[PDB]
Amino acid sequence: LIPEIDAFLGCPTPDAWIEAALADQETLLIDHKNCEFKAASTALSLIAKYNTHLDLINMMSRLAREELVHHEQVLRLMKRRGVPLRPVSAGRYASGLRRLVRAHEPVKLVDTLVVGAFIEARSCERFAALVPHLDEELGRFYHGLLKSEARHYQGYLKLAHNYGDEADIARRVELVRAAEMELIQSPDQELRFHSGIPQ
Amino acid sequence: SLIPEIDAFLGCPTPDAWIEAALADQETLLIDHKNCEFKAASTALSLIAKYNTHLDLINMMSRLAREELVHHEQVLRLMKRRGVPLRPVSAGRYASGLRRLVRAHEPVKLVDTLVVGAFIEARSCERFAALVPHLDEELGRFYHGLLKSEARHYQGYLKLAHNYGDEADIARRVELVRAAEMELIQSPDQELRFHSGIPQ
Ligand SMILES: [Ca+2]
Ligand SMILES: [Cl-]
Ligand SMILES: [Cl-]
Ligand SMILES: [Fe+3]
Ligand SMILES: [Fe+3]
Ligand SMILES: [Fe+3]
Ligand SMILES: [Fe+3]
What we know:
- Chain A: GO terms for molecular function: metal ion binding; tRNA 2-(methylsulfanyl)-N(6)-isopentenyladenosine(37) hydroxylase activity.
- Two copies of one chain form a homodimer.
- Chain A has helices spanning 5-8, 15-23, 25-49, 54-81, 93-98, 107-130, 136-163, 166-185; strands at residues 187-188, 197-198.
- With 199 residues, chain A is mainly α.
- Chain A has one domain.
- Chain A has a two-stranded parallel sheet.
- In chain A, helix 4 (54-81) runs antiparallel to helix 7 (136-163).
- The longest helix of chain A has 28 residues, at 54-81.
- The complex binds calcium ion, chloride ion (2 copies) and fe (iii) ion (FE) (4 copies).
- One chloride ion is lined by residues 65, 69 of chain A.
């Protein structure tokens, strides 16, 4: 039935992360831009690996296009606000979750899709947490992205059920949820969209 | 303008022997074509990640990747309507043979990469044009729409190469890739792919 976002997630975005993000919105926007790109890149990696899974490929191709639209939309917002194209390395979050995916098919694919649902669900929750503190234009933008993330979280989890058993997805969601909460609540060195709490 | 016409830019026409082989296995051709549209988008994203502060490149490649993913989905839709199942079709030799020509150090590595992209798109355009007289109406109409986009992408790759490179250096990168590209197209090949040589 797909749980609601806060139910699905193991913890709220911490206040300390919101404070850090509001104080460095330039790094936030750039890593946000990179996350949209990486979502599209990840979608295409799934097409490449599961290259005769027609349901997956059709969903992923369309998902990749929507994320590239978001990618371009952040670049245009950066241009409007004079944010420079500054290199920002990937954070620990997605690769930390990917470590949990099992090595053998078909549960390898199932685990990968569950991780995708968590990343989208956290993005939705975190956009929601930021909106009331942002200027009008950026809050409206992030509130607009909030609805697409909810759809993407639902899609990943639904695609997981198209390829895995209910009981096997249940255990996997429980395992990722615990690790995801740890990544969000533990201290992190720097500000990323999906980073932990700063020191 | 030094964006030549497609046929002038290219070192040879598509051989008749390739057309004959393509018409006898349009199912492999369609599947490989679908993968090529996919591979164009993934290459565009690969360029974005590698050249993550080249702003003009990123804006072009992001839109280009979306257009190629639309083409990817369009081939899939056409395959579904015609009952063409998916099956594994490994990449051919063409693009990998061309990428071996790219020089190893920047900024000419980027320039050479963009030149190679221009040749891949120009060849696609020429080869679609060679095919459509021989195809059914629906397939020909679809391939003709793609041919026009390929002409645009060829121009875009070449324009981006000049945006980052000097005219004289590009001019002789093009001369070297052109000779290799003609060799890959005219020489015998062990398989049929959209960009294969002459199969046997
Ligand atoms: Ca919760
Ligand atoms: Cl603050
Ligand atoms: Cl699009
Ligand atoms: Fe997005
Ligand atoms: Fe998303
Ligand atoms: Fe295309
Ligand atoms: Fe193209």
